Design a protein around this ligand. Structure first.
Ligand code: SR
Ligand code: SR
Ligand code: SR
Ligand code: SR
Ligand code: SR
Ligand code: SR
Lengths: 63, 63, 63
């Protein structure tokens, strides 16, 4: 992966160190979760106004 | 959930922000784990005196 | 476990506290992951020279 190697290799020395792999992995886990949480958020917030009022939170219960 | 919305909404402005959801989730994950760990602890500690001596720890091995 | 109780019991008072269990668990989770990551690393790095060049990273893709 052209682009991908360049992302993980932060100092740009053409090599991917351990700290680098360990960092990318960490970074990736983070984003993945952020992304999932927001998807759930923007979801509950029906009127996408950025907040969840008692009603939306209320309409968010199937059992 | 009456009580529940009030817990997640910390500043009490009637709304639940993203930071708020993200926080509650975090808080919840924490407690869940604490609770599980302790259940395992209080378990091994047969004489519930708050400590696990070599014997209890010893009697805690099925294979 | 002879050796094991002594590892978890850090202050060496013959007892294993909660903080102690909670710590060992944490410590263990850490090592386990470090170990796995490295196994993946040393793996990709075919010439075990400590770095992963564009080629190895390149030869590391089955689909
Ligand atoms: Sr590098
Ligand atoms: Sr809304
Ligand atoms: Sr709020
Ligand atoms: Sr005990
Ligand atoms: Sr102790
Ligand atoms: Sr190499």
């Amino acid at each position: 992966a052209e682009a991908l190697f360049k992302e993980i290799d932060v100092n740009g020395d053409g090599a991917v160190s351990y700290e680098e792999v360990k960092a990318f992995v960490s970074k990736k886990r983070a984003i993945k979760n952020e992304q999932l949480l927001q998807l759930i958020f923007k979801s509950i917030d029906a009127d996408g106004n950025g907040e969840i009022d008692q009603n939306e939170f209320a309409k968010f219960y199937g059992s």
